[model samples]
Target: EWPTHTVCKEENLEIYYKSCDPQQDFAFSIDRCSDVTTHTFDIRAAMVLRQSIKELYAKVDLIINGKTVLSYSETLCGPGLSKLIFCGKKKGEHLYYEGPITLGIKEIPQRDYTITARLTNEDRATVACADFTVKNYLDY
Candidate 1:
C-alpha cells in the first residue's frame, strides 16, 4: 500500500509501490515509516505458485535528479547472489516474509529519487515488481 500524506504536507518521507504483474498480488509495508536506514519489511504474496522456486533474481534501477545512476541485474540466491529471505521457496504456497534490512550506508544525496525493482524466479516469472519514489524533506 502507498503511504498517505496530509494537506499540509507534514509527512517528510513516503514510500509508494505498485505491482507490475497482474496475477502477482504483492503487498509490502515498512515499520515506523520510511527512511534510508535499517527498517523492518513485511511482504505478502497472495497468490499460489505453480512451480518450485530455487532461484531468485533482482533487477534494480536507481534514478536520481533525472539521471540514471545505477542499473543492474543479479542473482539473489547463490554465489553472485546473497542468500537471503526468499531462497528455495517451494511451490503451491502463500509467501510472507518479515525481516530487517539496513540500507544507504554510503553517502546518499538528500534529493528525491526513483527506484524500479523487479524480482523473478528461475523460470523468469515475476515474483514481485515495484516502482517507488522516496521523497525526502519535501515539506522543509
Candidate 2:
C-alpha cells in the first residue's frame, strides 16, 4: 500500500509504504527542480514483494522522450522482497518494473507522470502489477 501527501508547490515529496502496521510509514521530501524552465520529473519507491518467493528479482525501466533512460534489475529479499528505486529529474519518464516489489517516487516534474510495477516468482510466474499517475502540485 502507498501513502502520499498533499501536493504543495513543486518541491520534493516522499511517498511511503508500511507493511504489517500502518503507523510505521516513512517518507522524505525535497525541492530539486523548483527552478526549471520547461518541466522535469523524477520518481522513487521502496518495493516489497510478498508470497513464498524463491529467487525473486526486480527490473526497473525508465522511458522519456521516447527513449529508455534507465533499465536495470536487482535481487529481491528471499521469501519476500523490499527494494527502493529513486529517479532524478533527469530520468523522469515512463517507469516500469517486474517482480514482487513495493516502489516509491520523488522529485518529479509538476506534470503528468506514469509509474508501473510488476511482480514475479522464481518460476517466472506473474504475481501482481499496478500503475499510478502523478499530477502537478497545487498551492495548499
Candidate 3:
C-alpha cells in the first residue's frame, strides 16, 4: 500500500506498504515535495524488503506527458543510491533498512503539467508508479 499526499505542501508525507511481495514500508517528507522549484530535498526512508534480498537497487524518473525529464537511481554500492541502504540482518526473519536521500532537481517547466512518477527495483519490477498533475504547485 502507499500513502497519498498533496503534491505541494509543507508537511511530512509518507508511503507505506504492508502486503507487498514479502512486505516492505518506507516514508519520507521534505518541505516541498511537489514544489517544482525546490532543488534540495531532505528525504528519509525506513523499510524492510523480502528477507532474501542481500542486494538491491532502485530507479526513479520524473516524467512529463510521457517524456522523461529527470532520472535518479541507487544501488548497493553507489555514492547516491548506496546511501539508502542502512543495514539489516538484525530483524532476523524480517528486515531492517533506512537511509537519507538528498535529492536535487535541475530543471522544471513552469506550466500546468502532467507528471508521471515511476519506481523500479533491481529486477526491473515496479515498486510503485502513478500519474499526478501539477496546476497550482508550480513554484518554478
Candidate 4:
C-alpha cells in the first residue's frame, strides 16, 4: 500500500490527492505499486458522492522528467469506456469500489512517472483527483 497526502506540491510522493468538493467525501488508494507491463493496477476508493453522477469524465496527464508527455480526456460513463463503479450513483450514498483496472496501453520505459488524474461528474465537480508518482516502476 501507498501513503496518502493532501498537498500536491510535493515531489516523488507515492500518492498525493485532493478532493475538489469539500462536502463530498472521496478517498483513493492502491493495493500496491502499479505495473505498466501488466497494463493493470489494483485500486480502491470510498466515496459519499454528494450529487447524482449521471455521467463521468476523466482527465489524465502523464508526466515524465517533469514534462507532460501525454494528456488524455475522455468519458468514463458512456460512449467511451463505461466504468459503472463511478456512474449512475445516487446522492449521499456511500460506495466502495475495489478492483483492478486495465489501461490497455503499450509498454514504456521503466522509470519515474508523475501522473495527475481527475474524475469529474456531470455537474463539472471533480469527484476524484490525485497526483501520484511511481518510482522505478518496472514490474509488480
lDDT of each: 0.60, 0.38, 0.42, 0.65
Give the best candidate by lDDT. 4
Show model 1 residue runs off by greater than 4 Å: 1-10, 38-51, 65-67, 79-82, 107-109, 138-140
Maximum-TM-score candidate: 4
Write the residue-wise lDDT of candidate 2 on 5-94 in tens digits.
432244442222222223222222323333222234333333333333444555545444445566666665343454424121121133
Worst 10 residues of 3 by lDDT: 13-22
Candidate 2 at residue 9, lDDT?
A: 44
lDDT of 3 by residue, 1-140 (tens): 44444435433222222222223434433344553344444443334433323334545455566687777665642234444343322222333333333445453445545445544444455443444454433452
Q: Rank by TM-score, highest first.
A: 4, 1, 3, 2
Q: What's the true lDDT of residue 28 in model 1?
A: 62
lDDT of 1 by residue, 12-131 (tens): 765566666566555566544433423333332344555555887889888887788999887776545656765677887666666544443332234478777887888888777767
- Candidate 4, residue 43: lDDT: 74
TM-score of each: 0.69, 0.36, 0.46, 0.70
By descending lDDT, how would the candidates be arranged?
4, 1, 3, 2
Comparing 1 with 4 on TM-score, the higher-scoring candidate is: 4
